[PDB]
């Protein structure tokens, strides 16, 4: 058995070591071909047909690239082929945990269907990885290629999800700390996963990516930082680093958080919730699971893909009527109507426990206008979106180590004032989108009045179209004028 | 209802008239989101995740582009916006008839399941279009936008499939003849459908497209050709036109006819054949249809997509075991092994009615070599592939009209000798690919011996790896030496 | 006589009306083939070989595109073919005024050699366009294609430079105000010139551009804003607008203001200053001019291009030795050394009249470090760069009007807080770069010491490599530690 | 230390300090002032790229190929010395080009000095020697582990071939494959082509079909005839044919563009009219001409596209006629394209007869009334040999292949084993005819003469034959 070459639109010709090939050629990995990277985004950006599978290949490739470059520049790090293979495997497998329509599953469906559990795609990925190894006798192949399965499986899982619970890692010692910054960077979020999705998502969406991962790779080194060996970027790349996150933000504003994409995710979630009692997924020992419980059995989860959508759409079962209908409404493009967007002012933040209270608040608004219809709380959808640089309120560049030309081995820090006064003063904010489930002109008008009045009452920002959609409300709010 | 703008990775921002929007937002059209453009190609080129849907959008867009250019350069053709809309609709809808995994369904599955029928994706597109129209109340929307449904529906269908059986079309008369050359060009095959798939497939496969359709559009006029107003190209462009077909050939060589992608379409077709007795698809009136018979009822065929693959894969029904296993072997990458490629010589033309006899012939070869194992007819797959410029043995450029800069309204002919002595001297050929279903090393060596001796016997071309896989057989053939 | 097609790597096939071709095929215009768009940038980014000529073609093309789109969507604006042609000509001709190495000439050389005249590339463009018209018999051609030369040349000039001095323009009445917002937008800087240079400079530099001008064009309309018709953008696009300027800033940071690119422009400028007494340029009537005086005779300025560089480089004249010498140092890559970059803190700005005193300040600093070399003012270069969004301190998005989907003829304003809290809080800043004209190690060490001490003394920002290049200076400053 | 350079084609290119020392000389930086495609820029405005960036690209790709080969096959004993030398060879194999590139070696020199056998290869060797010697590079070379005598020999050999049974002195037979990288004398598959495909395509605004990276990945070193040579994987054969196809296409669309060619022609004419008056100072303060600067590398260093502008900006009467020609180019008053034909049959047009062809066209007798008479002096006849780089040969016949079942074993693949749709021939000629008289009467007349001349010699029927000469084509029964 030998290496295989794969041609990828983003990276060109990727070499895949036989062990990696063995891992890829499993039902657990091949499953990723049937899950859309951007989920509902595909129904807004037609080019976004790409799946988690090709992305996974890309991430494995890039992890390989960065670890190899680091090894070639700095022999003294003692990076082994075993290290390279473990980092490649981690990169390759860090998307195994995703569910139907990707972020629709972990971001919307699971939190609603199973609020008592704290599910993440990372946990899902380690579980699916374990299932993959155990179902396909991978351990002897790992040993055959020089790996030490106990240590190395620990290492890979640690790369994916973090310490499994003072150096908290068992897979590798502190002198290899930098290896943990490659596939999933918990320290500052700068990892190859982002690079691949920037390039790939851009390629498919019809948006241009402005981040140069190659340049970053060429200017990266390993330096000592607080008794670990960590990845450091050349000082003059700091601007580019800020720009990387800017790029991420932009991709979220244009595509990932598109109003219509989000509402389509929401409707699919509604359909899944209404179908959860009736769809059966047959897992280990012939036991039967729901969509909401497939996460409890990896054999079942292996069979849980975008297919579900179609299974609901093509169904005849009367019990599934209500689910089916919603999906049908998606096909006819009879979607919930976007009412508007606003933001909190002051220091005010909206917390997850208070999400449920928002539709009620909106309907309880009393706009001083002639209305024809009256709207209820259940007619309203309030979608709140946390936009940040990946570390909540923190500036992630404050967690980046740099090096200078004249002392390549000395790590330094760079503050925001040292770069540009035109950079963000803040690194997190919330966007509030309001939609209406009633799609008639009268109802839409009413919902617009309710929404603007609500915005005024809570001292939120004036909606961009406010004077147009509610010319009777906005002048009452002096804070807007 | 206003026009909508859609962002496409290939074409950028596409404007869609409200009528086209109404047509697109139906189950019949949205169905195409669930059928891979290149089918099994995705399992070889991971970037090739694109579906028939977005391709259809691109075809409609380019149809619009070309008819608009023709109109704006020559107002004397009296091209109406009704004509523009009908050409756009035809462009949009000429992929509606495709089935699961695209060509796998009409090039392999249907011919083997229903050999009595003569089914084409064109006819399917016609039927599905009629179904879409009737099921969605489109006729009065058409009327709302100035269309005359009888004549215009006729025109659209004629653009898709040709004369519905002197001037043979009922939709438009001779003075609009050129309109029939835009969406599906039966005259020489130069149409916008090709242009979109060149660009799109290249974008996803990771091959670069060297054909410039924008340039062709720029240089296109319409001149008089035997009392017909036909589309003519600028003389200068003849080389490019030749290369257009060359490009097609290359794309077929590199991707569409890739040995493994083809063997994978073959395995999926086998599994569809074995699942054939047991999968049910609900058609009109609850009547149970069928993978091989869903084509008889459009309401059912609307539900026939790539999902079938998954339905088989995820099944637990014992009757389906046989199909299931096959799909599973695709996931484990246990495919039929490629043995080789050869070509006929001289005047030999392998006919359709001999394909079935082919595996027996290889199996019945006597190579004068020691074999640990002998193999049977069953063990063999012989795939015959007809590569051509789209008009059998004919030069399609001989069916193209050109114009000269000094007299733009005067159509002329250009012959191959007026172009280059480096052009093809043939415009059709046959490729013979052989695989063995027995994948062990011993069996494969055997298969290679059998195969080469078969090539020497039928006086086919020597396989490229002939002197390495069968060294005790190649010195028998003097033509090969 | 007839239109021509030109194939451009950015825009593809560009159609040029015969009048435009007439204008283009003159010495005054073809001159632009011999002036690098990015000047000294080519000596850092080898792909940036592009000249002002191709950029001019692109700008004319885009101006045409925007005016055409506006006319097509809004026939009630009464945009004539004459308007379209005049906008195209202004677009084609707004780069005529550039001198050798573009921004090196108008940004560095002229301010030093002719500080009494207030020269701009705009004014130079007007003069050169006048010279083009008058030297090439263009007026009768204009008349031949339906233009009225007094009015229309006035219009074109006004598009290039602004009012030649209520409605201040004389080329077109108030109802055509929007037409002045296309080629050079003095209201907010959003124009087609930027769009072309974004795409082109990116294509050649090897940086991907983030901005989608086609999308902008699709979402642009004309609306009435305070008794004026202006180009308005869809509200939804506000984000992208901010990002446009972000892009500009980034392009300036990565490429246009690259420290080395700038130092090479500076050295070329020095050479030109040292060559000015001895270079002769034959102007009107055999009359001779200097590099510094070529601008007061258009006939001489026509022959003033990048060629000068080579003329100096290949000279044998003893009197040119020194100038030649400098150019030679550029070839051996013996450049002035970059010492560092810093910024003022808080609110303080560096006034222009103070620039000249800066190198003396650096040389006057007293770093507590033992040095063998003492440097003087003449050895220091202090380059002050104003980075902004094109309107000094003002947010240009505050000078954009938008429209909403439900009332697209109604113009509205959108404020920064209505968009995002992550946007810039300021729109102007200054970067101070310091170089040393002595290039030996010891001189560079000293220069670094003086520079960091100077930064501390003026309470400027701590340089990014401060602790590395000057470990004995930086701990003195508590604000830095 | 190393330097990184960002290139739009290859992205970030790392440059070893020795390469940097070589690049930062007047002899190398010279290439910034010579257009890759010359007159092509006056037709494809995106084609502003110069030989400098192309050279960087070639050096980079040479490095890539050698590194890949080494890493896949350690048994080859490819040293860092070998890598650096192959890189230098890649970087420096364009040093010999003159003003407007091929215009200078394809057109000017053959007319200015018809006795010399000038090639850009030899010029590259001479210029490389001049660079090394003028910039104290040999000590730097030994400073980075190279042995100047052997290695400079090796580099020159990579550039021009055997300087004077294994003909090479720079490296023995077990390193033969190294000579197949920068300039492949054997089959023309080299990294120089790869770079110009991608770069020229990027600037022209036409897309590249060929995937060099794939080739690099499916490339090996296998033993052939006591030589270790680069072999491609069998399945790549189609692609290889396509490579040459792409080349042909690029010549068809861009490099041999009728107007591009006529502009190179006009510039050549202007340089010829300027030759006696343009002084270029060389070694010793000696003065040279455009035509003789190739005899002194110091003067040649200063011979770039700038000549054009020096002629265009001149005032002296002696240069007027040169100057005027350039001015016509600016006014787009170009010589007029009359038409194109090809010779039929196995027959070919020898370079010996090229000078006679303009007389022939003016000697034709079209049976039509013509206002004007044209002289041989009024016609330009430009003949262009289109081929796969080995005259009449099929370069794929000179490629070695390997199969995945035994990848250390060279094999051959014939055209018949591949496809019936491939070219049946691998060389042909194109004849373009122009008229220096641009008035309408003259152009009509020229079209008559030309079509009649095509008829008289049984040349191929011009595509617009019926349109431009309707009275002429009927006599030729074969044209219908
Ligand atoms: N750019 C490009 N990619 C290709 C071409 N042919 C195949 N590919 C892609 C498809 C795959 O993702 C990858 C590998 O395909 P290959 O045909 O080279 O390997 P394959 O396993 O099919 O054959 P093999 O086992 O080596 O005999 O490259 C080609 O001619 N050009
Ligand atoms: N290139 C690009 N495409 C975008 C951007 N935002 C959305 N798109 C894509 C998605 C769609 O394919 C197409 C239209 O999206 P829009 O957001 O402009 O239309 P939408 O119906 O959502 O809003 P609307 O009804 O007009 O208020 O453009 C963007 O910022 N850049
Ligand atoms: N993409 C592409 N561009 C081409 C091709 N041939 C020429 N071009 C470029 C060069 C020019 O910028 C532009 C126009 O060149 P043309 O050859 O079509 O016009 P030309 O004046 O030479 O011929 P004409 O006067 O129309 O008989 O297109 C081609 O085959 N493909
Ligand atoms: N893609 C990209 N290229 C850049 C950027 N900045 C500069 N370049 C290009 C210009 C050069 O061709 C190449 C190297 O420039 P650098 O600024 O990295 O090196 P430089 O010598 O100026 O600084 P140094 O001596 O290392 O401190 O990269 C950037 O932000 N992005
Ligand atoms: Mg401006």
Residues C326 and C365 in one domain: no
Q: The CATH number of the domain where A226 resides is what?
A: 1.10.3210.10
> What is the signed CA dihedral for B413, B417, B423, B427, rounded to 10 degrees?
60
**Cα-atom radius of gyration of chain D, to the nearest Å?**
25
B16 Cα–ligand 2 center, Å: 13
Half-sphere exposure of A272 (CA within 13 A, CB side): 30
Residues D147 and D244 in one domain: yes
Ligand 3 atom with least separation from CA of B212: 1
Q: C84 pairs with which residues across the strands? A: none
Any D CB within 8 A of C42 CB: yes
Give me the total of CB pairs closer than 8 Å, taking one residue from chain A and one from chain D.
20
Chain D residues within an 8 Å CB radius of A7? 214
Query: Ligand 4 test: best mutation among A209, A213, A215, most atoms within 8 Å of CB?
Result: A215
Residues C166 and C64 in one domain: yes
Q: Please tell me if the CB atom of residue C5 comes closer than 6 angstroms to any atom of ligand 3.
A: yes
Of A356, A346, A345, A336, nearest in space to A437 by CA? A336
Ligand 3 atom with least separation from CA of C12: 1
Residues C350 and C374 in one domain: yes
Of B166, B167, B161, B165, nearest in space to B185 by CA? B161
C390 Cα–ligand 5 center, Å: 8
End-to-end Cα spacing for chain B: 72
Bridge pairing between strands D287-288 and D336-341: unpaired
Which residues are within 8 A (CB) of C164 and not within 5 positions of it... i.e. 6 or more apart?
C154, C157, C158, C170
Q: Which of B235, B418, B421 sits opposite D461 (nearest CB)?
A: B418
Q: Rounded to whole angstroms, how far apart are CA atoms D431 and D261?
A: 12
Q: Rounded to whole angstroms, how far apart are CA atoms A119 and A124?
A: 8
Note the residue count of chain B: 481
Burial (CB count within 10 angstroms: exposed 0-12, middle 13-18, buried 19+), residue D178? buried
Shortest alpha-carbon distance between residue A121 and chain B (Å) = 22
Helical axes D191-204 vs D51-72, angle rounded to 10°: 140
Chain C residues within an 8 Å CB radius of B13? 214-215, 218
Of B80, B227, B222, nearest in space to B155 by CA? B80
- Which secondary structure element, helix H or strand E, spans residue A430, and what is its range? strand A428-436
Residues B247 and B119 in one domain: yes
Residues D289 and D382 in one domain: no
- Edge to edge, what strands does the sheet with D336-341 contain? D336-341, D427-435, D379-387
Q: Which of D52, D205, D310 sits opposite C9 (nearest CB)?
A: D205
Please check whether residue A52 is in contact with residue A37, taking contact to mean a CB–CB distance below 8 angstroms.
yes
Q: Rounded to whole angstroms, how far apart are CA atoms A89 and A61?
A: 10
Residues B190 and B146 in one domain: yes
Residues D338 and D327 in one domain: no
Q: How many domains does chain A have?
A: 2
- Which secondary structure element, helix H or strand E, spans residue D381, and what is its range? strand D379-387
Bridge pairing between strands B401-404 and D11-15: unpaired
Q: How far is C-alpha D93 from the chain's CA centre?
A: 12
Give the domain extent around A79.
Answer: 1-334
Q: For B59, which DSSP code?
A: H
Q: Please tell me if the CB atom of residue C7 comes closer than 6 angstroms to any atom of ligand 3.
A: yes
Which residues are within 8 A (CB) of C192 and not within 5 positions of it... i.e. 6 or more apart?
C59, C62, C63, C65, C66, C91, C182, C183, C213
Q: Quick one: resolution in A?
A: 2.1
Q: Please tell me if the CB atom of residue A44 comes closer than 6 angstroms to any atom of ligand 2.
A: yes
Backbone phi and psi for residue B172, each to the nearest 5 degrees, phi listed first: -145, 150
The residue from D318, D333, D348 where one domain ends is D333
Are A253 and C239 within 8 A, CB to CB?
yes
Any B CB within 8 A of A314 CB: yes
Q: Rounded to whole angstroms, how far apart are CA atoms C51 and A14?
A: 37
Any C CB within 8 A of D302 CB: yes
Q: For D34, which DSSP code?
A: S
Q: Which of B210, B406, B464 sits opposite D467 (nearest CB)?
A: B406
Are A465 and C207 within 8 A, CB to CB?
no
Q: CA-CA distances (angstroms) from residue A381 to A267, A270, A362, B472?
A: 11, 12, 9, 76
Instruction: Classify residue A100 as left (phi > 0), alpha (psi -120 to 50) or beta.
Output: beta
Please confirm, yes or no, whether D49 is among the known catalytic residues: no
C6 Cα–ligand 3 center, Å: 7
Residue environment code for D373-402, b if the CB has 16+ CB neighbours within 10 A, otherwise e: ebeeebbbbbbeebbbbbeeebbbeebbbb
A15 Cα–ligand 1 center, Å: 12
Which residues are within 8 A (CB) of A163 and not within 5 positions of it... i.e. 6 or more apart?
A169
Of D8, D315, D238, D219, nearest in space to B255 by CA? D238
Strand locations in C212-259 (E): 220-224, 229-234
Q: Rounded to whole angstroms, how far apart are CA atoms A51 and A62?
A: 17
The residue from A286, A311, A334 where one domain ends is A334
Q: Please tell me if the CB atom of residue C240 comes closer than 6 angstroms to any atom of ligand 2.
A: yes
- Edge to edge, what strands does the sheet with B428-436 contain? B337-342, B428-436, B380-388
Q: Rounded to whole angstroms, how far apart are CA atoms C199 and C176?
A: 28
C9 Cα–ligand 4 center, Å: 24
Q: Rounded to whole angstroms, how far apart are CA atoms A126 and A121?
A: 9
Any B CB within 8 A of A51 CB: yes
Residues B116 and B236 in one domain: yes
Which residue is closest to B28 within chain A, CA to CA? A331
Q: Rounded to whole angstroms, how far apart are CA atoms C457 and C452?
A: 9
Q: Please tell me if the CB atom of residue C45 comes closer than 6 angstroms to any atom of ligand 4.
A: yes
Instruction: Catalytic residue, from C50, C55, C98, C121: name it.
Output: C121
Are D6 and C53 within 8 A, CB to CB?
no
Strand, helix or coil at B183? Answer: coil
At D99, list the tokens.
Answer: 């003003």
Residues D329 and D339 in one domain: no
Strand, helix or coil at A3? Answer: coil
Q: Please tell me if the CB atom of residue C254 comes closer than 6 angstroms to any atom of ligand 4.
A: yes
The residue from C295, C318, C334 where one domain ends is C334
Residues D302 and D376 in one domain: no
**Planar angle of CA A312, A316, A318, nearest 5 degrees:** 95
Which residues are within 8 A (CB) of D115 and not within 5 positions of it... i.e. 6 or more apart?
none
Any C CB within 8 A of B12 CB: yes
Q: For B369, which DSSP code?
A: S
Residue corresponding to tokens 């407007």:
D100
Q: Rounded to whole angstroms, how far apart are CA atoms B337 and B444?
A: 8
Experiment used for this model:
X-ray
Instruction: Catalytic residue, from B55, B98, B121, B204: name it.
Output: B121
Please check whether residue C322 is in contact with residue C328, taking contact to mean a CB–CB distance below 8 angstroms.
no
Residues B406 and B281 in one domain: no
Which residues are within 8 A (CB) of C54 and not within 5 positions of it... i.e. 6 or more apart?
C8, C200, D45, D46, D48
């Amino acid at each position: 058995d030998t290496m295989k070459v794969i041609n990828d639109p983003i990276h060109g010709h990727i070499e895949l070591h036989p062990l990696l090939v063995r891992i890829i050629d499993t039902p657990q990995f091949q499953r990723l071909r049937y899950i859309k990277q951007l989920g509902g985004g595909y129904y807004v950006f037609p080019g976004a047909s790409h799946n988690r599978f090709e992305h996974s290949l890309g991430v494995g490739y890039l992890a390989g690239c960065l670890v190899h470059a680091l090894g070639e520049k700095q022999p003294e790090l003692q990076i082994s082929e075993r290290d390279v293979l473990c980092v490649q495997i981690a990169g390759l497998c860090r998307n195994l945990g995703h569910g139907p329509f990707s972020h629709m599953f972990d971001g919307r469906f699971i939190p609603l269907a199973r609020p008592e559990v704290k599910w993440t795609h990372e946990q899902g990925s380690v579980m699916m990885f374990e299932h993959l190894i155990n179902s396909n006798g991978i351990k002897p192949v790992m040993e055959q290629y020089g790996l030490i399965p106990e240590e190395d499986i620990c290492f890979i899982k640690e790369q994916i999800v973090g310490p499994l619970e003072l150096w908290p890692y068992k897979g590798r010692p502190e002198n290899k700390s930098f290896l943990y910054e490659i596939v999933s960077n918990k320290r500052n979020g700068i990892d190859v996963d982002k690079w691949d999705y920037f390039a790939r998502d851009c390629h498919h969406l019809g948006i241009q990516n402005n981040f140069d991962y190659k340049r970053f790779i060429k200017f990266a080194r390993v330096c000592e930082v607080d008794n670990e060996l960590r990845i450091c970027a050349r000082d003059k790349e700091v601007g580019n680093l800020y720009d990387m996150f800017h790029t991420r933000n932009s991709l979220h504003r244009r595509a990932y958080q598109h109003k219509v994409g989000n509402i389509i995710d929401t409707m699919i979630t509604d359909a899944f919730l209404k179908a959860d009692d009736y769809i059966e997924i047959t897992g280990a020992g012939g036991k039967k699971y729901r969509i909401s419980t497939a996460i409890d059995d990896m054999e079942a989860y292996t069979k849980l893909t975008d297919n579900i959508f179609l299974e609901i759409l093509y169904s005849t079962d009367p019990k599934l009527k209500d689910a089916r209908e919603i999906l049908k409404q998606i096909e006819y493009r009879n979607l919930f109507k976007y009412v508007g967007e606003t933001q909190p002012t002051g220091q005010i933040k909206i917390k997850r426990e208070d999400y449920e209270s928002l539709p009620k608040e909106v309907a309880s608004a009393k706009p001083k206008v002639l209305l024809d219809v009256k709207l209820k709380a259940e007619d309203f959808i309030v979608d709140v979106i946390n936009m940040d640089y990946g570390m909540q309120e923190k500036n992630p560049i404050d967690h980046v180590s740099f090096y200078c030309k004249t002392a390549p081995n000395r790590a330094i820090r760079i503050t925001k004032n040292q770069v540009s006064q035109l950079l963000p003063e803040k690194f997190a904010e919330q966007l509030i989108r309001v939609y209406c489930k009633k799609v008639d002109r009268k109802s839409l008008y009413a919902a617009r009045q309710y929404f603007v009045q609500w915005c005024a009452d809570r001292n939120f920002t004036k909606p961009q179209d406010g004077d147009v959609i509610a010319p009777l409300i906005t002048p009452q709010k002096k804070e807007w004028n």
